[PDB]
């Protein structure tokens, strides 16, 4: 009847074996059985964060029903998961959903405790388009219904605890977020399932690496689900990287190129070269087909092993005598040993086609899923670390301390030596004014992501008041910009791997440092909506120029250490001391000498040449002009920006003056020669 | 017909006599009738805190319409009341509140200038979703509606000063708070209704006592409502006590238990004992039935008395001539005198019991939900229940309290104005605690202010109250919240000499006005509280010269010292500076004994029977004693030197609850024994 027209038997798919081997969580199944045989508050309801196999725990109940692990009073029962959507559709006329639903009610009354109902997302039973809550709630508040609920904690606060008229029908059957090692056992059983569909093999160190690196890095998804999806996705990655070669593409583009060349030339030699490479192509192609046939035979006989296991479970339920012993002691050891023979034969023959999932597969999948360099070190990264030290000396000459500090920090990040209790680089910069601080931060941004401004430049010169935390973090609910979120929650919770930059942090009003405490202790941050934000894959650089007078007074005739401790005491006067010791290391800059500014002049002149190429001009400077610029754009008191002003003035004022005259023709190398005082551009 | 859906014909209810014969308030009713017969702006509002019966004022107006006391614009009208919450609560979508609202206006125009409207919660109608005031704007303006408001003054100044159409499409009618005597006459009018309902009688001196205690021990609720609740709940309690009984339950359980025993035994004696207890139970039962029949007759004749009163009011409306004199001169005095015969009869026969509710029932209802003056007669004994010595200060404080509750001096001047001197630790603060305790309520239900701290202008801005638009604002001064949340407490001022002398100006405004203006624009009165100022200026002057030197001259000497210190204006306003001399070594030893008493109380809370040597008590009293500080070093030293070695031995597994534990001396210390 309508049970067969609108419900879904979970125990039939348990009988058909389609469902998942639910491993672990025995205790909650036991507590569920306990609540099920309770007179008052009869219907249990499952409570957890989503993604934790609540539906699977109900199917594991069904597993123990069909296998008979349940108590005798629950043997021979029925588990029919009612479809709401089946009920909704055909009710075109008036009260047909009423009619259908009351017929389901009557049939459930007729079944008399034999069928046990399970409808999750219980709010849909509260209303299904009067409709369902007012119709079922009688059988709820009469005890004839013996259903099981399952929900997210959100509906347990919203749509359950509000109606206290539903309180004495239920029970906080709380499912906990599972741990690492139960996820490892679950993944062992589901490896045994999943290798059917992806036709591959999975190493167990790769499984414990999946559990470990899933639990460590992501936060939006939880055990067990994130590690399981890493398994499924990386198995698909293996499936694809087996599913087409690459050396075949190399040689195929080569032979079609030599084919086009030989057909164009119609000396030859290319018939011979093309024939040899076509022979190579056909050999590797046929080897590819033979090894794919090895995959085929191996995985089909593996699937036959699995079907033997399923059928011998069928015989365990039914109870045949010679069929049990026949299937076991015949079918299992021979298929196992020839599956191992095919496995060692693949260990012989699989050349370009590593079908066993390493942990590096998992790490690459995770890296391209989160953003962190989780993938193992291709040696472009090692030369990139050589380039880290060197290329920091490219866009920043001078100030070798913080160069070393940031270099060491990303080094301790990449080799896994970082601390997963804190974000990676908890830096605070200091020093005199205009001396490449924001430059170093853009230099990292240019390094790490090949983009000068791709970095969260939250500027602590707006936050001079109390309500500015409500600017950057977010808004508490009910109020104005609550649904838009803040800025830091957006720009971190999307992509957890960036250079969080806090420009001029001393100007912010000193309640915002509470947020900095939660950052530079934990790296999870209570935003205004309710949730958290992982910071432990970021770098938090903060800039300021607190001890300006002190450092420009005393960088000469002093060490680095007592200068550091002296400006450290100044910071102790300015921040909370609870803040300042939650820092990796305060670095101390200092102003520049003449060679530094001369090199900076070389830098700005090279980007100026980069500019004037686009207009169409090229300049080779007099070396005497370097001396005039270094005399002009220099002072220890104010750092670097008088050089930008001096070069800007003394070059580009007569230069632009004479460009707009139409006088300086594209085609001539503009030798910027000098007068005794000024710069005179010539045309030769 | 939304009138059937949303309104209440109060004229029908009072026409059927359902409503209160509301008493008084005639000036305000008349001003409402003035407003209700204007050409435009035909809407009064009623401004008063809820529970003053503005509803009942409209009800009494409706009863006057039933009487027809109205001028010639109101004869034949129908007064109908309405909520806004009945309209707001059905707003699923756009335009569902407002269909109801316009259909209301269609019924209002449909009755064609015949219906007077009532709406309370006017400040509710401000906010519903524009929403509500603008649809009522034309009918409020064009005379086609006769709305009557009811709200509170705070909600008036919060809501109704916003929309000007919400202002001038209404009119203020001020609603006042009812007095003591008018409440008495009201309850006299309400006495017969209550006595009809709860089937019992009421003591009218208990009514005026209920009024007195309702003003006395209740702060929130007010009149008529709080006395209504008191008399109703007391009458219900008495009606439950009558409509039960307890000795009948005891006798019934006794006879059924002895019946089961005699059924088991079948020597006897139990047939005889059972027959005696059944006879006694039957006597109590027949007495119970006779009492219930007597109260039944009393309630029936009381209800017939009320029906005769309703009939003579109907004769006053209709105008029957001989019916007036007949009903009055016959029916009223004979039914009242045999109702009083029933009163004295039930005073005779209710035994197990009363029906006339006394003021002790009011005390039950009140303290659940009277020796004050005579305790104040023995108030010095009360203060020396706990604090030994300093008899003169106790006497003077009791003099001040007797002058206070006797009310001789200026009532606009505060109760206690006392500067205290001498060395501390003897129990000045203990005197403050016990003073607030046996004076009003409790030891630490007070306010303590550390005036050692406050030495500058910003310090004054702290304790007084920051001016608005500055640092320390939205919860007043240090003082102001502390008193405004504590309407009856004691203010404590420690180390008055450390203050900058400008705070003394605030003290002088206290002593003159008693109302004190903070930075928050509201005066928090001190007239129902006690200010205590304390210091220690002439401590050594007393310590050196307490020996055989009197109270008065030494008081005058240290008063001259204070005159060297403080303002002459300040010492002008002092009631009295007591001495607070150091008492003695034996009295401070006795205070240590009382600390041992509360200590042994806490040991008995753990459950130990512990005794002590008196020499051990002397060593205790000589451990931490100092004249320079008082008993507080003695208190903490005895507390440490007991709690450390004793509980050390207890956690050493030595002391057993239920043994002879004599705190015997060591050579310098105290050991406990186990015997």
């Amino acid at each position: 009847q309508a049970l067969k027209k609108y419900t879904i038997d979970l125990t039939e798919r348990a009988e058909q074996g389609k469902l998942d081997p639910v491993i672990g969580r025995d205790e909650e199944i036991r507590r569920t059985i306990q609540v099920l045989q309770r007179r008052t508050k009869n219907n249990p309801v499952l409570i957890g964060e989503p993604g934790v196999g609540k539906t699977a725990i109900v199917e594991g109940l069904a597993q123990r029903i069909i296998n008979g692990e349940v108590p005798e009073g629950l043997k021979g029962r029925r588990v029919l998961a009612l479809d709401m959507g089946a009920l909704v559709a055909g009710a075109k006329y008036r009260g047909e959903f009423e009619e259908r639903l009351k017929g389901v009610l009557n049939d459930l009354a007729k079944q008399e405790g034999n069928v046990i109902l399970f409808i999750d997302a219980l709010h849909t039973m509260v209303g299904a388009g009067m409709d369902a809550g007012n119709m079922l709630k009688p059988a709820l508040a009469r005890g004839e219904l013996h259903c099981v609920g399952a929900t997210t904690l959100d509906e347990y606060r919203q749509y359950i605890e509000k109606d206290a008229a539903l309180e004495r029908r239920f029970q906080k059957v709380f499912v906990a977020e599972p741990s690492v090692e139960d996820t490892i056992a679950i993944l062992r059983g589901l490896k045994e399932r999943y290798e059917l569909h992806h036709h591959v093999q999975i190493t167990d160190p790769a499984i414990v690496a999946a559990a470990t690196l899933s639990h460590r890095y992501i936060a939006d998804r939880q055990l067990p689900d994130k590690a399981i999806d890493l398994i499924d996705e990386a198995a698909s990655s293996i499936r694809m990287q087996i599913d087409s070669p690459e050396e075949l593409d190399r040689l195929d583009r080569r032979i079609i190129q030599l084919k086009l060349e030989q057909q164009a030339l119609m000396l030859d030699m290319l018939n011979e070269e093309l024939s040899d490479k076509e022979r190579q192509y056909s050999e590797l192609e046929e080897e590819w087909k033979a090894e794919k046939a090895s995959l085929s035979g191996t995985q089909t006989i593996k699937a036959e092993l699995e079907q033997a296991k399923i059928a011998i479970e069928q015989a365990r339920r039914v109870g045949d005598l010679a069929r049990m012993s026949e299937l076991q002691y015949g079918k299992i050891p021979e298929l196992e040993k020839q599956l191992e023979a095919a496995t060692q034969l693949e260990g012989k023959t699989m050349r370009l086609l590593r079908n066993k999932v390493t942990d590096a597969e998992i790490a690459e999948v995770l890296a391209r899923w989160t953003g962190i360099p989780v993938s193992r070190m291709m040696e472009s990264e090692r030369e990139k670390l050589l380039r880290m030290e060197q290329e920091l000396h490219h866009r920043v000459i001078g100030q070798n301390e913080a160069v070393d500090a940031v270099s060491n920090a990303i080094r301790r990040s990449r080799a896994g030596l970082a601390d997963p209790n804190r974000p990676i680089g908890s830096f605070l910069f200091l020093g005199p004014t205009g001396v490449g601080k924001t430059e170093l931060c853009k230099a990292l941004a240019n390094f790490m992501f090949d983009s000068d401004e791709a970095m969260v430049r939250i500027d602590m010169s707006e936050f001079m008041e109390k309500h500015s935390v409500s600017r950057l973090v977010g808004a508490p609910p009910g109020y104005v910009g609550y649904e838009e979120g803040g800025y830091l929650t957006e720009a971190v919770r999307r992509r957890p791997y960036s250079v969080i930059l806090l420009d001029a942090v001393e100007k912010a009003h000193p309640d915002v440092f509470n947020i900095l405490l939660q950052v530079l202790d934990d790296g999870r941050l209570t935003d205004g909506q309710g949730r958290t934000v992982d910071f432990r894959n970021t770098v938090v650089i903060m800039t300021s120029n607190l001890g300006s007078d002190l450092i420009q007074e005393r960088f000469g005739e002093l060490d680095y250490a007592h200068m550091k401790e002296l400006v450290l005491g100044v910071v102790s006067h300015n921040f909370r001391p609870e803040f300042i010791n939650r820092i990796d290391e305060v670095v101390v800059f200092h102003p520049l000498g003449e060679q530094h500014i001369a090199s900076i002049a070389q830098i700005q002149l090279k980007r100026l040449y980069k500019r004037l190429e686009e207009r169409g001009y090229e300049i080779h400077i007099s070396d005497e002009a370097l001396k005039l610029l270094s005399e002009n754009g220099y002072d220890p008191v104010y750092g670097a920006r008088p050089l930008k002003r001096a070069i800007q003035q003394q070059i580009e004022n007569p230069l632009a003056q004479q460009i707009l005259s139409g006088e300086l023709v594209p085609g001539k190398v503009i030798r910027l020669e000098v007068n005794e005082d000024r710069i005179v551009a010539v045309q030769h | 017909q939304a009138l059937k859906k949303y309104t209440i014909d109060l004229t029908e209810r009072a026409e059927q006599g359902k409503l209160d014969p509301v008493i008084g308030r005639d000036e305000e009713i008349r001003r409402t009738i003035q407003v209700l017969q204007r050409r435009t702006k035909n809407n009064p509002v009623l401004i008063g805190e809820p529970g003053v019966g503005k509803t009942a004022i409209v009800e009494g107006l409706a009863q006057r319409i039933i009487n027809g006391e109205v001028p010639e614009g109101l004869k034949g009208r129908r007064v109908l009341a309405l909520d806004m919450g009945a309209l707001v609560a059905g707003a699923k979508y756009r335009g569902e509140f407002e269909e109801r609202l316009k259909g209301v206006l269609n019924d209002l125009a449909k009755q064609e200038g015949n219906v007077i409207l009532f709406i309370d919660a006017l400040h509710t109608m401000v906010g519903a979703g524009m929403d509500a005031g603008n649809m009522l704007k034309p009918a409020l303006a064009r005379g086609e509606l006769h709305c009557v408001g009811a709200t509170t003054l705070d909600e008036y100044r919060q809501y109704i000063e916003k929309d000007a159409a919400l202002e001038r499409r209404f009119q203020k009618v001020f609603v006042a708070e009812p007095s003591v005597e008018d409440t008495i006459a009201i309850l006299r009018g309400l006495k017969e209704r209550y006595e009809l309902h709860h089937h019992v009688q009421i003591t009218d001196p208990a009514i005026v006592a209920a009024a007195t205690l309702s003003h006395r021990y209740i702060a929130d609720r007010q009149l008529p409502d709080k006395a209504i609740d008191l008399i109703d709940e007391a009458a219900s309690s008495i009606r439950m006590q009558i409509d039960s009984p307890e000795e009948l339950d005891r006798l019934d359980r006794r006879i059924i238990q002895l019946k089961l025993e005699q059924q088991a035994l079948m020597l006897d004696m139990l047939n005889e004992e059972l027959s005696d207890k059944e006879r006694q139970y039957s006597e109590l039962e027949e007495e119970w039935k006779a009492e219930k029949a007597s109260l039944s007759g009393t309630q029936t004749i009381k209800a017939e008395l009320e029906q005769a009163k309703i009939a003579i009011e109907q004769a006053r409306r209709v105008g029957d001539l001989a019916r007036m004199s007949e009903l009055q001169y016959g029916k009223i005095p004979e039914l009242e005198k045999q109702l009083e015969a029933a009163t004295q009869l039930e005073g005779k026969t209710m035994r197990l019991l009363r029906n006339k509710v006394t003021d002790a029932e009011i005390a039950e209802v009140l303290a659940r939900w009277e020796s004050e003056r005579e305790k104040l007669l023995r108030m010095e004994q009360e203060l020396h229940h706990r604090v030994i010595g300093q008899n003169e200060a106790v006497d003077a404080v009791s003099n001040a309290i007797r002058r206070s509750r006797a009310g001789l001096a200026d009532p606009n001047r505060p109760i206690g104005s006392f500067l205290f001197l001498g060395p501390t630790g003897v129990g000045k603060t203990e005197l403050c605690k016990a003073l607030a305790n046996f004076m009003f309520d409790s030891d630490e239900a007070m306010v303590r202010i550390d005036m050692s701290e406050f030495m500058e202008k910003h310090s004054v801005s702290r304790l007084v109250g920051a001016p608005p638009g500055y640092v320390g604002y939205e919860e007043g001064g240090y003082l102001t919240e502390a008193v405004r949340r504590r309407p009856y407490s004691v203010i404590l001022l420690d180390a008055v000499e450390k203050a900058h002398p400008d705070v003394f100006n605030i003290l002088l405004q206290v002593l003159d006005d008693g109302r004190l203006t903070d930075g928050q624009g509201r005066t928090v009165d001190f007239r129902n509280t006690v200010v205590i100022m304390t210091s220690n200026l002439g401590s050594d002057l007393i310590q050196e010269r307490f020996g055989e030197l009197d109270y008065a001259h030494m008081k005058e000497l240290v008063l001259g010292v204070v005159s060297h210190n403080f303002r002459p204006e300040f010492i002008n306003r002092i009631d009295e500076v007591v001495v607070f001399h150091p008492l003695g070594e034996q009295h401070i030893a006795s205070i240590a004994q009382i600390q041992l008493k509360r200590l042994y109380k806490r040991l008995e809370e753990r459950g130990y029977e512990i005794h002590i040597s008196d020499e051990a008590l002397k060593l205790l009293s000589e451990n931490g004693y100092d004249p320079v500080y008082g008993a507080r070093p003695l208190k903490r030293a005895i507390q440490q030197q007991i709690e450390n070695p004793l509980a050390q031995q207890i956690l050493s597994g030595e002391l057993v609850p239920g043994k002879v534990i004599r705190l015997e001396v060591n050579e310098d210390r105290i050991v406990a024994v186990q015997h």
């Binding site: 109390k466 009910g478 109020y479 104005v480 | 707003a91 756009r94 604002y473």
Partner: peptide, 24 residues
């Protein structure tokens, strides 16, 4: 038979305020 008619569904949001001290 009839149709599930569309609705109107009036909704609302709110505001905080902010008060600001002076130092002196």
């Amino acid at each position: 038979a009839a149709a599930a008619a569309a609705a109107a569904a009036a909704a609302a949001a709110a505001a905080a305020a902010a008060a600001a001290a002076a130092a002196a």
